[PDB]
DNA sequence: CACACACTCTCCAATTCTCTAA
């Protein structure tokens, strides 16, 4: 502690708004680098320097006021890169014991502090001016090393998880990430990233710039981002007032339902009743104590508690909630998406795929590739759609690449038990890219150009002719697990399956498409009967449970697919389940049932079919209890 | 000591289980077309009562989540195909 | 049956045909026009 | 003190891992 304190304090003193450096500050930062290179496994020097706030106190002023001293400046850059190194790299993995997890949290906290400090615009101003000089110069080993360390510093400062206990910030208040992005915008380093992506002379940095862009966009999604016009602020003011109004009215309605559920007498107003026609758990009739108003809508679980499901059985949950970034940052990010899609997408994505071909990329950089393939394609689909700006990734090669990556992640999820959630998150990225490619090949049919219509028919013909793109949905549904995959994965999978079946229906009903794969015959309803499985309907019902929280498009997709599977294939008895009937009971008893007309009508249809079967025979009630295989044909 | 009930296939094939479920709806009546919500409420009320009598420890939805899995087992399945049709 | 064979051949040719798109990449320009 | 908090300690059994038949 003492030697580190002496060496760090040796660097310089800060006077007001100016920083004065001691003559041996270069040797001082070299000593700090030496200590960091000889840390303990607890990352003790990183902890101590973060606690001392030496980065904010000394290195940022040195960066912003003594960048002319080049031998000091590059050492300061390397030191900042080492200090800002992400905690997962510092420890190798997320620890699983209390002491090392505490050390991880402490280092992470100091990374929060570093990210908050780097939002000062002068830091990225100096970095952008330096990198501008370097790219004008671009060439030496030291020069490209300095470029790499500047880009790694930007990557490091962008890549910290936000401590949302302290960043517990509302709808469009500027987060630390928002302020960092705004500082990048004001310093003009976004223009340098655009130059690196658009330029063909230095494509080795294209992978790094893709990483920088992927870390820039984390809260945002393209459909909302593309619609941020200049007049959006006034619209969002009125929208916020309307949302508050409907929320308050909903809460008042819920309060009144609860008030009418209980009586108007006080809690200890006694009196007990016997329900003569209702047996208790014994032989005698049930004695009820909670009042007539609780009997008016009687349930046999009023007094019970939920069960403690064990840790290994609990469902997965969402890792994020949609706080928007500040509106100015949203405008800047929309402009960045526009310029990136126009000037940068094709060359950068070709260079990144070339990097994957050369196989010098790290072990999971295709996740960044598939992120961009989802994000910027969907941004192009939003607002004015133009396939010419994004032509490169429409190749069938991208479909094959996504398919092999998705199947690899699927197998690793099924085998690599200790890392299954991360493999699920990678498979979700691949699924999202696949969905967006299905969306764009759907979209371009509406375009007026015969050439891209020809390209669309080519892509659809080969993609529906090749079987492995087709059977992947059945594989995903058959091995979907709520315990590992969040509800957003299931939502995206259902949306993708609905879109894929829609396009396949249109293709088969407008063209022959008579053979698949070595040709073998094919018809559309044969493939649809594959989805007539207990697991598939179980997953669809699992997503249907959240119908209030689901988007309207998600409800449309789920009810459309279930209505297809029940009506057109004539397999209503597959959907006869008692959990499903509880879902329908809550759906029909919903006060907001009028907003879900398709869902309630479908529920009444399937219920009418069930009660027809029940009127035929009493066996329907017993068969309703248990999930059911192809022997359902007895019931039908 | 430790006389804790379990809700396994032996519980489900007990008298209160599927043999009872074969008979609980003998007293029931339904309105049919255009009143499927009311018929559903009566249906869930009857089977919720049956679940409560069979295994009072659980809430109804949790009981359904248990039993929908537990029906796969061979003992309760053989008793199911006995209850279906007749012995 | 001969029609089935001809359908297989023609759809093979259609799915094998290369893509045609309104491809472009915009004007190259040095870092000065980007940064300032 | 005899009737309640708080903690430790013990064995039962609830759920998953692995091998096998349909």
């Amino acid at each position: 502690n003492c030697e580190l304190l002496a060496t760090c304090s040796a660097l310089g003193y800060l006077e007001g708004d100016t920083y004065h450096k001691e003559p041996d500050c270069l040797e001082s930062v070299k000593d700090l680098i030496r200590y960091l290179r000889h840390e303990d496994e607890t990352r003790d020097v990183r902890q101590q320097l973060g606690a001392a706030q030496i980065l904010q106190s000394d290195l940022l002023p040195i960066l912003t006021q003594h960048h002319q001293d080049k031998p000091l400046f590059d050492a300061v850059i390397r030191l900042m890169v080492n200090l800002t190194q992400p905690a997962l790299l510092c420890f190798g993995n997320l620890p699983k014991e209390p002491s090392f997890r505490h050390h991880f949290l402490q280092v992470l906290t100091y990374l929060q502090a570093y990210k908050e400090a780097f939002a000062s615009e002068k830091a990225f101003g100096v970095l952008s001016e330096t990198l501008y000089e370097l790219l004008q110069l671009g060439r030496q080993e030291e020069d490209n090393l300095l470029i790499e360390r500047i880009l790694l510093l930007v990557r490091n400062i962008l890549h910290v998880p936000a401590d949302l206990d302290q960043e517990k910030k509302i709808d469009d208040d500027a987060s630390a990430h928002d302020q960092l992005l705004w500082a990048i915008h004001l310093s003009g380093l976004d223009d340098l990233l655009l130059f690196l992506a658009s330029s063909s002379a230095e494509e080795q940095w294209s992978l790094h710039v893709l990483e920088i862009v992927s870390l820039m966009f984390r809260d945002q999604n393209p459909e909302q981002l593309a619609g941020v016009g200049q007049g959006r602020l006034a619209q969002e003011r009125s929208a916020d007032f309307a949302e508050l109004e409907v929320l308050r009215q909903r809460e008042m309605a819920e309060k009144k339902t609860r008030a009418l559920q209980r009586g108007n007498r006080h809690s200890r107003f006694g009196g007990s009743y016997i329900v003569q026609g209702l047996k208790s758990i014994g032989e005698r009739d049930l004695i009820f104590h909670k009042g007539l108003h609780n009997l008016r809508n009687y349930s046999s679980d009023l007094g019970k508690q939920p069960k403690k499901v064990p840790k290994r059985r609990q469902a997965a949950r969402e890792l994020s909630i949609q706080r928007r970034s500040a509106l100015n940052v949203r405008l800047f990010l929309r402009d960045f998406c526009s310029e990136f899609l126009e000037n940068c997408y094709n060359r950068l994505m070709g260079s990144v795929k070339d990097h994957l071909l050369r196989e010098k990329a790290q072990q999971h950089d295709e996740t960044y590739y598939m992120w961009a393939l989802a994000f910027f394609m969907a941004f192009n689909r939003a607002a004015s759609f133009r396939p010419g700006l994004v032509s490169e990734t429409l190749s069938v090669r991208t479909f094959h690449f996504i398919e092999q990556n998705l199947t690899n992640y699927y197998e690793m999820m099924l085998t690599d038990r200790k890392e299954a959630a991360s493999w699920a998150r990678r498979m979700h990225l691949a699924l999202k890219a696949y969905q967006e490619l299905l969306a764009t090949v759907n979209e371009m049919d509406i375009s007026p150009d015969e050439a891209v219509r020809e390209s669309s028919r080519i892509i659809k013909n080969n993609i529906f002719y090749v079987m492995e793109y087709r059977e992947l949905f059945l594989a995903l549904f058959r091995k979907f697990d709520e315990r590992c995959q969040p509800r957003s994965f299931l939502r995206d999978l259902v949306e993708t399956t609905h879109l894929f079946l829609k396009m396949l229906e249109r293709f088969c009903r407008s063209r022959g498409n008579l053979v698949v794969q070595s040709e073998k015959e094919f018809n559309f309803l044969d493939y649809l009967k594959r989805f007539a499985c207990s697991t598939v309907v179980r997953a669809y019902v699992l997503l249907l449970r959240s119908y209030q929280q689901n988007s309207a498009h998600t409800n449309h997709c789920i009810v459309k697919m279930l209505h297809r599977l029940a009506h057109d294939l004539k397999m209503e008895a597959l959907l006869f389940q008692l959990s499903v009937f509880c879902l329908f009971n809550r759906l029909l008893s919903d006060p907001a049932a009028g907003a879900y007309k398709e869902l309630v009508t479908f529920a009444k249809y399937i219920l009418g079919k069930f009660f027809a079967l029940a009127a035929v025979n009493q066996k329907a009630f017993v068969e309703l209890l248990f999930w059911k295989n192809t022997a359902v044909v007895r019931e039908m | 000591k430790r006389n804790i009930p379990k809700l396994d296939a032996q519980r489900l094939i007990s008298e209160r289980g599927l043999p009872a479920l074969r008979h609980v709806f003998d007293k029931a009546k339904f309105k049919g077309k255009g009143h499927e919500a009311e018929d559903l409420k009566m249906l869930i009320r009857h089977m919720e009562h049956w679940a409560h009598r069979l295994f009072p420890k659980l809430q109804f939805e949790d009981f359904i989540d248990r039993v929908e899995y537990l029906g796969s087992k061979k003992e309760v399945q053989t008793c199911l195909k006995r209850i279906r049709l007749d012995l | 049956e001969a029609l089935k064979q001809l359908h297989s051949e023609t759809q093979r040719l259609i799915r094998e045909s290369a893509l045609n798109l309104p491809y472009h990449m915009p004007e190259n320009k040095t870092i000065h026009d980007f940064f300032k």
Side-chain angles (χ1 to χ4, degrees), chain A residues 44-58:
Chain A
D44 60 335
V45 185
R46 245 165 286 209
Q47 288 191 330
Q48 288 157 17
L49 293 177
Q53 302 190 353
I54 59 115
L55 184 135
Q56 309 94 308
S57 306
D58 300 303

Side-chain angles (χ1 to χ4, degrees), chain A residues 516-528:
Chain A
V516 158
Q517 188 175 2
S518 301
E519 275 66 18
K520 295 176 284 184
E521 299 88 345
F522 167 65
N523 70 84
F524 180 60
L525 268 61
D526 180 23
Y527 172 60
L528 260 45

Side-chain angles (χ1 to χ4, degrees), chain A residues 369-418:
Chain A
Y369 180 88
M370 280 175 287
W371 172 86
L373 185 36
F375 194 95
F376 291 105
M377 286 294 328
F379 191 87
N380 195 345
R381 274 195 66 253
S384 55
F385 173 62
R386 289 181 181 176
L389 277 62
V390 84
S391 297
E392 201 282 333
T393 44
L394 301 171
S395 305
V396 184
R397 172 175 61 267
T398 58
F399 290 84
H400 171 79
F401 190 60
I402 289 160
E403 189 273 350
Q404 68 179 24
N405 290 338
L406 210 158
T407 53
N408 185 42
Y409 300 155
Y410 172 83
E411 293 160 28
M412 294 293 172
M413 193 278 291
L414 295 170
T415 55
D416 191 2
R417 189 186 187 277
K418 304 294 183 176

Side-chain angles (χ1 to χ4, degrees), chain A residues 542-598:
Chain A
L542 197 144
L543 183 55
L544 182 60
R545 287 177 191 171
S546 58
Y547 69 96
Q548 291 184 352
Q549 295 80 21
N550 291 343
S551 62
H553 190 84
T554 301
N555 289 331
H556 177 272
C557 293
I558 199 101
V559 75
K560 180 59 177 180
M561 182 54 183
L562 286 171
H563 172 259
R564 181 198 291 276
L565 189 53
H567 180 274
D568 293 0
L569 272 60
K570 301 287 177 180
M571 292 186 71
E572 285 79 350
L574 179 59
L575 186 53
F576 296 173
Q577 280 298 128
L578 191 38
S579 59
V580 173
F581 281 21
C582 289
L583 210 172
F584 293 156
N585 185 35
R586 296 196 293 95
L587 170 59
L588 267 292
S589 304
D590 197 327
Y596 309 120
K597 296 287 289 187
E598 49 266 29

